[PDB]
């Protein structure tokens, strides 16, 4: 399955790390958990 | 375009408004701004 999200902006202490934070329900709804990784690409 | 980034909890204040927060790396790489769409696939 695939989830629509809108981006909004990394925290400070964020910057530079290749996370994508996401809450649980984007991530029960994907399959994933903390530490997976996702494919993300523009709509 | 698309990249691979990792999965990272949201912070509280953020759940259930269905946003992914990245940085201004990836999202150069995705050709989004802040604001934008984006479709999150499992990889």
Same mark, same amino acid.
């Given at each position: 399955?695939?989830?629509?999200?809108?981006?909004?902006? *990394?925290?400070?202490?964020?910057?530079?790390?290749?996370? @994508?934070?996401?809450? %649980?329900?984007?991530? *029960?709804?994907?399959?994933?958990?903390?530490?997976?990784? @996702?494919?993300?690409? %523009?709509?």
């Amino acid at each position: 399955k695939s989830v629509v999200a809108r981006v909004a902006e *990394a925290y400070a202490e964020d910057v530079g790390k290749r996370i @994508v934070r996401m809450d %649980k329900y984007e991530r *029960a709804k994907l399959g994933v958990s903390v530490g997976d990784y @996702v494919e993300v690409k %523009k709509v």
